Enzyme design. Structure first.
Site, PDB file in Angstrom:
ATOM      1  N   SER A 140       0.845  -1.232   0.000  1.00  0.00           N
ATOM      2  CA  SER A 140       0.000   0.000   0.000  1.00  0.00           C
ATOM      3  C   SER A 140       0.856   1.248   0.000  1.00  0.00           C
ATOM      4  O   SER A 140       1.498   1.469  -1.070  1.00  0.00           O
ATOM      5  CB  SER A 140      -0.975  -0.107   1.207  1.00  0.00           C
ATOM      6  N   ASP A 199      -9.786  -5.915  -3.280  1.00  0.00           N
ATOM      7  CA  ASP A 199      -8.994  -4.855  -2.611  1.00  0.00           C
ATOM      8  C   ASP A 199      -9.228  -3.540  -3.285  1.00  0.00           C
ATOM      9  O   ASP A 199      -9.049  -3.448  -4.503  1.00  0.00           O
ATOM     10  CB  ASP A 199      -7.504  -5.208  -2.576  1.00  0.00           C
ATOM     11  N   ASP A 252     -10.122  -7.134   1.943  1.00  0.00           N
ATOM     12  CA  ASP A 252      -9.335  -7.783   0.916  1.00  0.00           C
ATOM     13  C   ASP A 252      -7.936  -7.159   0.832  1.00  0.00           C
ATOM     14  O   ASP A 252      -7.019  -7.840   0.401  1.00  0.00           O
ATOM     15  CB  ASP A 252      -9.973  -7.643  -0.468  1.00  0.00           C
ATOM     16  N   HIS A 253      -7.797  -5.930   1.249  1.00  0.00           N
ATOM     17  CA  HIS A 253      -6.530  -5.227   1.173  1.00  0.00           C
ATOM     18  C   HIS A 253      -5.600  -5.443   2.347  1.00  0.00           C
ATOM     19  O   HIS A 253      -4.439  -4.965   2.275  1.00  0.00           O
ATOM     20  CB  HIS A 253      -6.780  -3.693   1.099  1.00  0.00           C
TER      21      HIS A 253
END
EC number: 3.1.1.3
Length: 265
Positions: A140, A199, A252-253
């Site tokens: 990220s 995500d 999901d991330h």
């Protein structure tokens, strides 16, 4: 085209993922010790330096695997307010080393504060192990900063080019415009851009604002057993996680391959 990840890539893509998630651990950065939940997996690596830059809070580390003949550079994603507000300052600014290119200012600013003391260890490290390779990984924001680094490193024309520089990111945000996506392709640096199922992050900032990704997209589409689909184009394509939009997720991330990436959980 579109093809599927061979069990090998899949296995290699989780290892980068574990380095990325262990980095959210206060005992790795900055404790600088392999004392974390998925730390035994990476415990053979010698941590060389850890950094927690003050304005942006950028957290990164340089480690060496001598069994693996690798030199690892790893950056952490958002963990503090200073990361979130950078995260948010997306005005595109200019890309200094490459005329006509634009990149999200916050991300630039974030790499610009650790940049120098970080580029000088890698090189120090590599001047002594010219045959090892350099693997750069990040989650990220970390993936965003991990990108700029591999670029800073291929630009210092110091022995590092496409055959010995590797980039792995996970749920990575977009970093710069179509020209920047393009210039990244040019370096030919090897770049595995992983995205987990629905995500959201990999979908922000929005493409309409002038944001385009570069990187072979490894899209995880199911988790048991793991299944990854690879869309081999090098620039962003409408056939991997771009087709599940607008039904995106946050959950999901925070999980890639079964590993919690965010919480050091």
């Amino acid at each position: 085209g579109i093809r599927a990840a061979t069990s090998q890539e899949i296995n290699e893509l989780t290892y980068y993922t574990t380095l990325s998630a262990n980095s959210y651990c206060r005992t790795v950065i900055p404790g600088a010790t392999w004392d974390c939940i998925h730390c035994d997996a990476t415990e053979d690596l010698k941590i060389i330096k850890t950094w927690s830059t003050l304005i942006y809070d950028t957290n990164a580390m340089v480690a060496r695997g001598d069994s693996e003949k690798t030199i690892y550079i790893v950056f952490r994603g958002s963990s503090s307010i200073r990361n979130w507000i950078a995260d948010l300052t997306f005005v595109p600014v200019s890309y200094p080393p490459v005329s006509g290119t634009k990149v999200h200012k916050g991300f630039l600013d974030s790499y610009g504060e650790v940049q120098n003391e970080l580029v000088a260890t890698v090189l120090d490290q590599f001047k002594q192990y010219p045959s090892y390779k350099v693997a750069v990984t990040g989650h990220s924001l970390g993936g965003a900063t991990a990108l700029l680094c591999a670029l800073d490193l291929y630009q210092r024309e110091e022995g590092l080019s496409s055959s010995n520089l590797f980039l792995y990111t996970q749920g990575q945000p977009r970093v710069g415009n179509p020209a920047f996506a393009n210039y990244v392709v040019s370096t030919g640096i090897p770049y595995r851009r992983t995205v987990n199922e629905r995500d959201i992050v990999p979908h922000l900032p929005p493409a309409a604002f002038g944001f385009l990704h570069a990187g072979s997209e490894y899209w995880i589409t199911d988790n048991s057993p793991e299944t990854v689909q690879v869309c081999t184009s090098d620039l962003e394509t409408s056939d991997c996680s771009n087709s599940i939009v607008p039904f995106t997720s946050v959950l999901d991330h925070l999980s890639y391959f079964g590993i919690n990436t965010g919480l050091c959980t």
